[PDB]
Design a protein around this ligand. Structure first.
Ligand code: HEM
Ligand code: HEM
Lengths: 149, 149
């Protein structure tokens, strides 16, 4: 499954190709996919809801999907993942960008780090459920998002 | 008209109210509005086109509107304006955020500063053409976007 500690083996050329292929369709309509992913996560994980101050009041999927706040947040998250996919060949660049992001989550947003892998799980499930390559990528992302904690 | 140098008088309580009212509808569907605004600007201002490297190839509105790159850029711009609107009562916060943005445009993106007021004009025209209050807000934004040049 998706891990958020330790280390994972590098991505093989074959895994990268599989990932790019599976990701493309999802990213094409990122504003729709991203919202579905965030909404699904938010609704099925009550404990995490307190970390989204701007969502106070919204409870049903309909309320959420109509909120510009929800859409903007979802679009930013989905695009951060997109940047990681585009940087799979440049692991150094991928790290820098995510380390910076980790700092924001730890110092400014103050979000509980345990939820990174939960949302990542939803993303993986939507893009290519069961694919070990994508799970590896998600794990890399989660490990880096926790680096500043 | 919109200016990008000097200084403009503070926004009066009345002007802020007018702005919030006119902005709300537009922001509700920011991903559509934003794209229309960016596309309109891009197509009617050939000189500026060279500053959008990722748009090379796209020439017609249809090609542009279908590009995820165009959509993402448009969504980021429209939201930067939204942040300014939401910070009208905290001029200090508005400045910090825009000064940071100015730096990116000057050091990393290398865009010609003369085009800020041209795009701002399109935004104003769409939201509330003729409103002096909105023009004042747009001028404040443009002046701050040029601060790092
Ligand atoms: C693995 C998925 C994750 C990625 C890739 C990610 C990415 C992002 C990005 C790119 C931003 C925008 C930061 C900015 O505007 O400078 C952000 C903001 C934020 N993220 Fe994360 N995030 C992730 C998971 C989470 C989780 C699980 C939570 C909640 C427990 C969370 C809560 C937040 C909050 C509260 C903000 C600030 C939103 C705002 O105030 O506008 N993120 N995240
Ligand atoms: C008054 C309107 C303007 C605002 C509020 C604005 C806002 C933004 C924002 C928020 C970003 C995202 C930066 C990031 O991701 O960190 C951005 C990127 C950018 N802006 Fe500006 N901008 C404005 C006008 C312009 C103009 C007129 C040009 C072109 C001559 C321009 C060219 C760019 C470019 C090239 C990028 C980088 C896009 C990329 O590589 O992804 N912007 N702008």
């Amino acid at each position: 499954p998706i891990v958020d500690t330790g280390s994972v083996a590098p991505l093989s050329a074959a895994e990268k190709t599989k990932i790019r292929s599976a990701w493309a369709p999802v990213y094409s309509t990122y504003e729709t996919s991203g919202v579905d992913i965030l909404v699904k996560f938010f609704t099925s994980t009550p404990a995490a809801q307190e970390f989204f101050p701007k969502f106070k009041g919204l409870t049903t999927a309909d309320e959420l999907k109509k909120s510009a706040d929800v859409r903007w947040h979802a679009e930013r998250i989905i695009n951060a993942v997109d940047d990681a996919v585009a940087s799979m060949d440049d692991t150094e660049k991928m790290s820098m960008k995510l380390r910076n992001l980790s700092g924001k989550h730890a110092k400014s947003f103050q979000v509980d780090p345990e939820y990174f892998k939960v949302l990542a799980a939803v993303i993986a499930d939507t893009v290519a459920a069961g694919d070990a390559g994508f799970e590896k990528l998600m794990s890399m992302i989660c490990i880096l998002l926790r680096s500043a904690y």
